[PDB]
Amino acid sequence: MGIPILKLGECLLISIQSELDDHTAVEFQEDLLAKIHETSARGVVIDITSIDFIDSFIAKILGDVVSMSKLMGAKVVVTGIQPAVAITLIELGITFSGVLSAMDLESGLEKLKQELGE
Template sequence: MRIPILKLNDMLLVSIQVVLDDQSALTLQEDLLQKIHETSASGVVMDLTSLDMIDSFIAKVLGDMVDMAELMGTKVVLTGIQPAVAITLIELGISLPNILTALDLEKGIELLRNAVIDDE
């Protein structure tokens, strides 16, 4: 099952509503990069609100997605990180440096707009 990627003005919105396994995470990575290429989106908001578990591989793929998108000139904001996910990331020793985060989708869109304006 593919995760939908919606275009909203000059940004993309990804809302992960399914349990991410290794293959679906890699598929999302490919789909997102292709959509960035097709739309020339200036930013991506990735909503993780429904994601209540994460492992080291999924965390690495998310971090790689952010790095790859930024190589393509697109800012990424992760929103809705659940407390259990944050705890797991810290306990696993996983660091996601330079990744913009926000508590919810609304704040994530605002943060992304400000980040894109600052880069112009």
């Protein structure tokens, strides 16, 4: 269903498969904000390593739910960004500050547990 199971240690580990469109990301937007309240989380970890190409209008929604998930009290992290998709994040109107990208899911939870509790 593209939105995998995520609860771990009062943090969330939501992976992403190969996407289809931003109308699939519409489903991805509702099924992240709903889970972050009922499971009272503190930080969402996103693994976009599976994708290798992303539409420019998609990244102004996946990049925009960063602003939504920060407002519900979750300093999210975007682990494992590929090179070719990052060349679609240069001609974008970048204001990517406070997003806290990382390298892998190993180092991703190492940085998030620094900003919470441990």
